[PDB]
Amino acid sequence: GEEECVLGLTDRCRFFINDIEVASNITSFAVYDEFLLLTTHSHTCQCFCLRDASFKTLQAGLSSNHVSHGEVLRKVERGSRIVTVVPQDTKLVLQMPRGNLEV
Amino acid sequence: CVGSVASGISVMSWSPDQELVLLATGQQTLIMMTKDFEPILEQQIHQDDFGESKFITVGWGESALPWDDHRPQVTWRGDGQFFAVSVVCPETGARKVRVWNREFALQSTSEPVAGLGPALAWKPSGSLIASTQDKPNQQDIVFFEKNGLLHGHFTLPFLKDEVKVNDLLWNADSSVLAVWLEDL
Amino acid sequence: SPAELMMLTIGDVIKQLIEAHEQGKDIDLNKVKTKTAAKYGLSAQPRLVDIIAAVPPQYRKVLMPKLKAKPIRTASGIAVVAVMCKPHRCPHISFTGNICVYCPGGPDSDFEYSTQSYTGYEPTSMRAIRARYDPFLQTRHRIEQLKQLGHSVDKVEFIVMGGTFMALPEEYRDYFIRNLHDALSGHTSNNIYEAVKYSERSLTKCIGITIETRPDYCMKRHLSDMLTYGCTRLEIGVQSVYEDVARDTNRGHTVKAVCESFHLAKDSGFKVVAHMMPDLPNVGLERDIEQFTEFFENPAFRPDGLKLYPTLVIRGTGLYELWKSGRYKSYSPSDLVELVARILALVPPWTRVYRVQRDIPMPLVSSGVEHGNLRELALARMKDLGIQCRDVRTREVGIQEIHHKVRPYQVELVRRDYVANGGWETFLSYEDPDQDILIGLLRLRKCSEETFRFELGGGVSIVRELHVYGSVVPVSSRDPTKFQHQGFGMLLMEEAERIAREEHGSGKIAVISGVGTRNYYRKIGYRLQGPYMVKMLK
Numbered sequence: 001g002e003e004e005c006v007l008g009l010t011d012r013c014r015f016f017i018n019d020i021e022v023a024s025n026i027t028s029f030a031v032y033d034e035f036l037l038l039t040t041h042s043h044t045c046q047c048f049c050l051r052d053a054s055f056k057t058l059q060a061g062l063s064s065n066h067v068s069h070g071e072v073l074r075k076v077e078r079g080s081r082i083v084t085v086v087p088q089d090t091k092l093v094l095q096m097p098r099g100n101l102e103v
Numbered sequence: 104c105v106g107s108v109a110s111g112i113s114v115m116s117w118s119p120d121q122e123l124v125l126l127a128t129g130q131q132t133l134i135m136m137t138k139d140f141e142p143i144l145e146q147q148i149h150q151d152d153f154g155e156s157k158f159i160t161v162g163w164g165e166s167a168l169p170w171d172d173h174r175p176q177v178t179w180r181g182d183g184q185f186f187a188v189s190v191v192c193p194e195t196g197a198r199k200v201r202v203w204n205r206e207f208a209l210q211s212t213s214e215p216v217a218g219l220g221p222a223l224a225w226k227p228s229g230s231l232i233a234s235t236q237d238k239p240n241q242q243d244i245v246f247f248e249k250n251g252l253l254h255g256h257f258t259l260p261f262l263k264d265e266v267k268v269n270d271l272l273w274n275a276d277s278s279v280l281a282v283w284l285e286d287l
Numbered sequence: 288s289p290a291e292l293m294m295l296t297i298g299d300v301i302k303q304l305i306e307a308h309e310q311g312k313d314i315d316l317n318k319v320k321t322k323t324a325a326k327y328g329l330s331a332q333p334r335l336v337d338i339i340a341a342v343p344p345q346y347r348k349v350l351m352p353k354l355k356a357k358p359i360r361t362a363s364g365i366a367v368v369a370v371m372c373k374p375h376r377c378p379h380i381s382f383t384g385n386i387c388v389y390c391p392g393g394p395d396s397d398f399e400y401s402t403q404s405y406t407g408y409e410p411t412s413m414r415a416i417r418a419r420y421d422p423f424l425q426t427r428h429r430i431e432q433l434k435q436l437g438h439s440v441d442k443v444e445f446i447v448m449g450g451t452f453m454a455l456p457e458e459y460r461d462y463f464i465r466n467l468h469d470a471l472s473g474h475t476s477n478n479i480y481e482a483v484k485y486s487e488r489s490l491t492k493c494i495g496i497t498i499e500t501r502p503d504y505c506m507k508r509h510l511s512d513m514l515t516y517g518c519t520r521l522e523i524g525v526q527s528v529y530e531d532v533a534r535d536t537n538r539g540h541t542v543k544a545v546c547e548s549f550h551l552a553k554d555s556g557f558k559v560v561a562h563m564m565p566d567l568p569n570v571g572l573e574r575d576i577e578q579f580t581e582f583f584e585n586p587a588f589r590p591d592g593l594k595l596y597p598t599l600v601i602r603g604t605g606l607y608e609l610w611k612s613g614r615y616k617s618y619s620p621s622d623l624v625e626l627v628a629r630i631l632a633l634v635p636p637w638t639r640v641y642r643v644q645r646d647i648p649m650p651l652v653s654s655g656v657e658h659g660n661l662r663e664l665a666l667a668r669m670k671d672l673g674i675q676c677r678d679v680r681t682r683e684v685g686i687q688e689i690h691h692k693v694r695p696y697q698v699e700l701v702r703r704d705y706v707a708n709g710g711w712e713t714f715l716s717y718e719d720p721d722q723d724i725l726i727g728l729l730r731l732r733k734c735s736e737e738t739f740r741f742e743l744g745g746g747v748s749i750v751r752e753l754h755v756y757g758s759v760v761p762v763s764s765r766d767p768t769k770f771q772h773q774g775f776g777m778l779l780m781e782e783a784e785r786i787a788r789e790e791h792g793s794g795k796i797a798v799i800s801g802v803g804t805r806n807y808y809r810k811i812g813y814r815l816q817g818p819y820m821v822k823m824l825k
């Protein structure tokens with residue numbers, strides 16, 4: 001929004017924005033060009049815009065009680081990790097346990 | 104004092120879940136006891152048989168390293184179903200590796216390898232056994248197999264006769280290998 | 288007599304069908320069959336082939352989309368014709384004294400007049416036996432059967448089976464290949480090159496040829512010879528990744544030779560399919576999982592296709608003698624199903640599994656597999672365990688359409704890169720992410736520093752396969768309910784031409800192709816050089 005925040009991830013798959021936990025099944029995250037990118041245990045990738053958002057909106061999105069609509073949520077393989085993001089070409093790079101890559 | 108051995112003890116090994124203990128004596132013998140220190144079995148290490156895991160075919164178609172201190176080495180698998188012992192055989196005069204199962208029956212004996220070192224460390228996940236080798240112009244980390252055959256290697260970044268490998272030890276989740284080197 | 292009653296029943300069925308077509312209403316076939324058979328007093332029902340074999344010509348053309356039989360035979364986008372060679376001995380009989388310890392049949396066996404590694408009771412084996420191993424007759428007969436079923440045979444692919452084909456005299460190979468091409472085209476040629484030219488100008492397109500070969504018969508000479516024939520796929524039997532197994536079964540070569548042959552073949556531009564065998568002697572239940580994990584994680588091994596052949600013991604072989612002496616025992620069926628499920632859970636998304644078990648008749652097997660649908664049992668077990676299979680075959684539109692009932696909705700573009708056999712491989716695809724449905728794929732590779740062909744030296748990137756699935760759409764026709772002729776091919780080539788110029792840094796792009804594909808790539812803008820279709824990228 002219009003305020004700085006500190007984002008944190010632990011090794012037990014817990015996501016904190018400032019001092020409030022907002023999600024509990026996260027394995028990777030990144031921030032690139034005013035966009036937040038997340039990967040979950042449920043084998044999903046999520047992308048949120050940060051230009052017009054608030055803490056309540058982000059918590060509502062990651063509320064675990066929300067019906068999915070096909071612009072924010074996408075399915076991926078098992079054990080995917082975010083390597084990097086190419087916003088100029090609108091691409092996201094992922095790596096898998098066996099060693100290959102995916103765009 | 105709950106136990107006593109006439110000859111000295113060389114190594115003591117405990118299972119990953121503490122329910123079985125292995126002791127090695129100074130008379131080249133291995134004793135397997137339970138948690139309550141009630142003896143279960145005792146056997147001589149230097150046997151003369153491959154085991155029961157033989158190789159079936161139809162028929163259609165040199166010395167230990169100078170800095171070796173001759174101590175035995177004992178290692179357990181991650182789940183405790185097998186274990187391995189490395190010792191200097193008096194017959195060949197080189198290092199030999201044997202693999203036993205949990206009920207203390209011989210399973211396999213390693214193939215002859217020239218230049219084998221004294222280190223040993225079973226991968227906790229239970230796929231490869233690590234060791235070391237010194238061959239003309241290089242020093243390698245080699246990987247054994249439960250069958251007793253070589254299945255891979257990689258090369259250390261050192262010249263010949265510049266360092267020695269003291270110990271090898273794996274990580275808890277089998278991701279990182281730690282190597283301990285001492286300069287000669 | 289029942290015969291004329293059957294004929295009248297058939298005639299009445301087509302009469303009702305054509306009438307309903309004329310006034311344009313839908314009709315249910317089974318109810319009509321039963322009702323019409325009731326009238327004339329029968330004790331049986333009509334067969335689909337009989338109804339197809341009595342339609343008048345124009346109506347034959349118009350109403351096949353309702354009477355087709357076995358829709359799987361062309362659900363992958365092509366029509367497959369399998370032919371066999373002449374009986375012969377495997378090349379390594381001489382310098383070893385004997386052959387592999389488990390291979391049945393052959394010139395010196397009790398299976399009379401049968402090719403090596405076959406019994407003669409198989410479907411394709413009985414087709415070539417009555418034809419006396421003549422390629423022209425076999426091709427004509429199989430195409431006639433395929434047309435009688437009710438399918439379209441516009442696009443064809445050959446599969447040559449038998450022993451080791453590339454170990455035969457040159458004249459016989461010339462004869463065989465030119466006869467295959469002539470049977471497709473209709474010409475009467477003298478040598479390979481004439482037949483290839485006329486087949487290039489033909490109207491029944493020959494997409495490609497597949498040959499099975501040994502690692503010691505895959506060198507520069509053999510690769511060039513197969514390149515002139517029009518071959519585009521290879522089948523090699525690896526069977527194991529362990530060096531002691533490869534010499535205790537009298538295989539005759541080593542694994543390192545297999546890896547080197549893989550490297551050469553992939554740099555030349557072919558496609559590689561590997562035969563593997565679980566339950567080999569001296570391989571327990573724990574070495575198989577490690578074997579396949581290494582197979583799919585080690586860059587030296589990663590193939591493009593797989594064939595799983597669990598070990599079978601058959602009479603008249605060394606393994607039979609081992610089994611009688613009480614020294615070899617097979618897995619229990621539950622263990623075998625569990626192992627196959629675990630193996631299928633590991634296949635990467637860029638690999639295609641063609642077959643899952645052999646096809647030997649049950650009474651001839653002494654021990655081993657006894658059922659006949661291992662693949663679907665394994666899939667059910669996988670569903671029970673909670674894991675899923677993600678290969679190429681079980682994700683394409685036709686298979687997903689006949690086994691399940693789904694259709695693509697939200698198609699997207701996907702790219703996967705990896706390293707294999709010393710080369711940088713890319714795999715482009717169009718697929719639906721939510722429902723996991725595949726449509727079209729393309730394979731690209733940057734040539735390494737050890738390429739020997741003259742046309743590919745100096746900065747050339749090679750395309751190894753382009754494919755779009757679905758049902759078969761005849762050339763120059765269009766069907767809005769199918770997936771082929773809708774522009775997914777020129778979209779996949781435009782992207783391959785951008786990677787090869789801005790990322791690989793190359794200055795030329797080459798394609799290995801058949802003949803109808805030759806005309807297609809000429810349409811795109813490629814020219815011909817040697818056996819390749821090339822284009823400048825500068």
Ligand SMILES: CC(=O)SCCNC(=O)CCNC(=O)[C@H](O)C(C)(C)COP(=O)(O)OP(=O)(O)OC[C@H]1O[C@@H](n2cnc3c(N)ncnc32)[C@H](O)[C@@H]1OP(=O)(O)O
Pocket residue numbers: 364365442492494519751752753754755756762763764771772773774775776777778799800801803804806807
């Ligand atoms: C080169 C190789 O290794 S093989 C290619 C794969 N082999 C096969 O034929 C199996 C399935 N193949 C296909 O789907 C197609 O034939 C492909 C892959 C060649 C092109 O896929 P599509 O997406 O169908 O191509 P696209 O829609 O871009 O092009 C359609 C045009 O190609 C033409 N075409 C398709 N196949 C051929 C062919 N073999 N020879 C000549 N023209 C052809 C069609 O007639 C159509 O031309 P038109 O409509 O202008 O008259």
Ligand SMILES: C[C@H]1O[C@@H](n2cnc3c(N)ncnc32)[C@H](O)[C@@H]1O
Pocket residue numbers: 389390391404524526562563564596597598599600601645
């Ligand atoms: C044609 C293919 O059949 C397989 N093959 C050969 N012999 C046997 C057998 N006894 N059991 C199972 N598969 C076999 C090999 O993998 C060969 O390459």
Ligand code: MET
Pocket residue numbers: 404449450451499500501502522523524
């Ligand atoms: C028909 S058997 C498979 C092809 C070849 N004979 C091989 O062993 O590789």
Ligand code: SF4
Pocket residue numbers: 377386387390391403404449450451501524
């Ligand atoms: S090379 Fe193939 S066909 Fe020949 S004997 Fe061996 S397994 Fe059988």
